[PDB]
Amino acid sequence: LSFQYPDVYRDETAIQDYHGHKVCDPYAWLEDPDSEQTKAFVEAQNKITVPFLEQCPIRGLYKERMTELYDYPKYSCHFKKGKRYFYFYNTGLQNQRVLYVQDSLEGEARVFLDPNILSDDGTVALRGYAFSEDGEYFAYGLSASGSDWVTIKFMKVDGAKELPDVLERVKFSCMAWTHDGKGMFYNAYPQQDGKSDGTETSTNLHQKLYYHVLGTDQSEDILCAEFPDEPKWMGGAELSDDGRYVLLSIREGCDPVNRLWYCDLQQESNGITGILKWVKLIDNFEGEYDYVTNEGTVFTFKTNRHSPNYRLINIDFTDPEESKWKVLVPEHEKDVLEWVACVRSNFLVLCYLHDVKNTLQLHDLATGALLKIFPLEVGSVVGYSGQKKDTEIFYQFTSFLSPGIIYHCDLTKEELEPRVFREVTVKGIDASDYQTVQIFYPSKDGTKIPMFIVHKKGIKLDGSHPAFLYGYGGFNISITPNYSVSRLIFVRHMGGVLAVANIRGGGEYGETWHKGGILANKQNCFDDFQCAAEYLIKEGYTSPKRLTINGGSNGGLLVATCANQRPDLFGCVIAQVGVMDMLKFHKYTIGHAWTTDYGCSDSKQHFEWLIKYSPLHNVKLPEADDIQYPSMLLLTADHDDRVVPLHSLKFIATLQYIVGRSRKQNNPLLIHVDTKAGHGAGKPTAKVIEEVSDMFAFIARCLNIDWIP
Ligand SMILES: O=C([C@@H]1CCCN1C(=O)CCn1c(=O)c(-c2ccccc2)nc2ccccc21)N1CCCC1
């Protein structure tokens, strides 16, 4: 290390008692983001990382090459609202993609909403939008500097006229227009004392559901639902297809379960004037209920009640008893039913997950019968468009070496032959030169975990190639095939191997796959992931010295632990906006919501699981002498209100102090706190290119790999 680590004050009086257990958190002052102490800390760390990163001549190689390979047309699915068609498009290197509008699939598209002119650095992103039933009015949310907070503004679709309406203090909101098109449903939070730009760590409780009449001030919005008894509950709302019913999904935590109330708008004496006459249909968190469509009083939902892999059921609001429910499409024994859409009045589009791959089939609404099976190569379905009134669908398909293909299908045709609408090609990369392979490796307990492997055709397995292993594991999130130029460059001009392990904790094999990697079995996640590395090492794909593991958010927690538990298995480690303090993660912003996957330190029983793997409280110098901690780069941003950066700070301070101080430790323990960025969504192209070029530079310079022109 040509640089020396900063002097961080250790508050040895900061001791807490956790059910008889006393834990010392000396860097607990970093929890205050506005302090002079913290500010001087972040700066101090950035003072030694930037150079380190910018000193390696491979960064500019990467950065420049990324800019070229990443310079390709990126479109989204076409979707029709009212009588117009819409689609997001990005000429290539635009910071934020733009929303286009055309009065006809053959008409001439025209800019509708360019968020690019709202910020010189593209740090103002669109976060959620909702057209009106007539497609004549449009409301969208904007986020500044990757912050979760949102401001909802409105626009008149014809002439793109901007309206005065504006809604503030919005977060994790729904946007449901009533069909009389007079107002929209949305959620807001109470006025809390202090900042509210995404730099605060304050808790978010008491979310309410309001109603905004178009043309009025938010001071007048109507309060339609609140659970003053249950601070952590979050009620989201949507309107049934026929627009006669307001369906309310009440949630608590990030579990695939929700309560479902409802309100017959025709039973409201004077429209919407306040708390609605809710009918508690499902008053429990036993299962999830995802509204698909409804014919009269028979509502069809995607549920996982007694169906770990999900299924379709029908409820008649007039015959509510669970007993009377009917099963439309039985749960599958192996395939997970991801999402469902109703198009052309009586067609249902079921999107299944088959061994981590996506399959699309058309079923009959009335019977559930399978009608057509849309042919798909290996990869995922990243976009879809088709509502109950539409007579055609669109779906974008992506893969590891496929930038994306947008298909189109006219449902008003005897022969349901789907055609290719748009096919984006990325010149400079020859898909025919790389090969994808899906293997199932056994974990510590004998469970088989799937893994995707992408490498050059013909590489000899001598354990000489750099390897990039990615995993998340948790919150029912499925890690499916996706395009990543930045990753392919790794394989191209760095000769490495890419690997994605669909370890437990995810929803690849239904909830039973989620529950086998959460709460008391969270260790399973780590073991699954560790075994993944062992596999690449054994099969000679790579080596502990040249293997890099990556992970963001709950995924960063994964790699952080995997280093604390087996630092001899990895050579490099890059944790992105990760959760490190498993003891008090629930005290900040939206962290309480995750207790359903990790547990809560406030509970004696939960503490025993958490204290065993909590990254912050488990850093330890290897006992061996020929073993040290893998070079690690932590990445976070000051506006990340999702996983407050206090997690990365207190963790870098500890890594540098406990380990960084030893003499046997040569590998750098660094951290990078980006400005004007948040958890990740809405990150402008510019910053994305800066970021990736930083990770692979770190990896290059850290493992000493050469560039391959
Ligand atoms: O980021 C996370 C976790 C896991 C998945 C998303 N997540 C979050 O907690 C996502 C936050 N979140 C939302 O954003 C919305 C929402 C719905 C509609 C529109 C806008 C928002 N609804 C939620 C309902 C319950 C709990 C959390 C919710 N983590 C980081 C660390 C591990 C958990």
From Swiss-Prot:
GO molecular function per UniProt: serine-type endopeptidase activity
Broad EC category: hydrolase
Catalytic activity: Hydrolysis of Pro-|-Xaa >> Ala-|-Xaa in oligopeptides
EC number, UniProt record: 3.4.21.26
Source domain of life: Eukaryota
Classification via PROSITE patterns: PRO_ENDOPEP_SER (PS00708)
Location within or outside the cell: Cytoplasm
A GO cellular component annotation in the UniProt record: cytoplasm
Keyword Cell membrane part of the UniProt annotation: no
InterPro entries reported in the protein's UniProt record: AB_hydrolase_fold (IPR029058), Pept_S9_AS (IPR002471), Pept_S9A_N (IPR023302), Peptidase_S9_cat (IPR001375), Peptidase_S9A (IPR002470), Prolyl_oligopep/macrocyclase (IPR051167)
Active site: S553 (charge relay system), D640 (charge relay system), H679 (charge relay system)
Posttranslational modification: The N-terminus is blocked.
Tissue-by-tissue expression: Ubiquitous.
Residues annotated with N6-acetyllysine modification: K156
Single Gene Ontology BP annotation: proteolysis
Keywords from the named record: Acetylation, Cytoplasm, Hydrolase, Protease, Serine protease
Family: Belongs to the peptidase S9A family.
Known function: Cleaves peptide bonds on the C-terminal side of prolyl residues within peptides that are up to approximately 30 amino acids long.
Protein name per its UniProtKB record: Prolyl endopeptidase
Source organism per UniProt: Sus scrofa (Pig)
Gene from which the chain derives: PREP
